[PDB]
């Protein structure tokens, strides 16, 4: 059973390759997750130089693959798809539509590489406005608390996730970002197909005072609820 691999602290590696309106970039993430408390401590670094998009627009993409660290209460343990697909893992597909702007289409794979949870991501962003909230860097360096609504897809032997992200613009306004996530297992083994529920997410963004590269330090708490 996959949940037995998450009883303690597990090291995490996130590698992202992106392209938004022709602007190519790479992000490397390192940290750890402790599913017993739904705790994620991560540090993401843009290894290609300056990030052409604001850091908050990438939080869901960079934390999507680590939803296996969500704290599922004991009474909800039969509803944990994420941990059940482990060690073999799952393929991730997401479409992030920014209101009155472009979209991000992501393809990722999350699995165990030894005793390390790895998330390899490819991001493709198109039709973004030059002086928009994204390419114009008009978004505040913060992240609002939200829910990730999960539904099962028995035909694909996986799950779906739907939620709205409201990014805070510097003028006090809001930039809506609708998310549609789809997860399909890599392995042939049995996975847990859940009833409708949600993941309550709280995220705190910060900077490392001694780090000179474009980066993002993240403290995140994810908890399953609804059942």
Curated annotation (Swiss-Prot):
Q: What is the effect of changing residue 174 to A?
A: In mut2.1; shifts fluorescence lifetime from 3.03 to 2.50 ns
Relate the outcome reported for changing residue 196 to I: In mut2.1; shifts fluorescence lifetime from 3.03 to 2.50 ns
* Modified sites of kind (Z)-2,3-didehydrotyrosine: 64
Record note on what altering residue 165 to T does: In P11; increases fluorescence at 475 nm excitation and at warmer temperatures such as 37 degrees Celsius. In Esmerald; leads to brighter fluorescence. In VisGreen; leads to brighter fluorescence
Record the organism: Aequorea victoria (Water jellyfish)
In Swiss-Prot or TrEMBL terms, this protein is called Green fluorescent protein
Query: What protein family does this chain belong to?
Result: Belongs to the GFP family.
Outcome reported for the amino acid change (mutating residue 147 to K): Increases fluorescence at warmer temperatures such as 37 degrees Celsius. In Esmerald; leads to brighter fluorescence. In VisGreen; leads to brighter fluorescence
A Pfam family in this protein? GFP
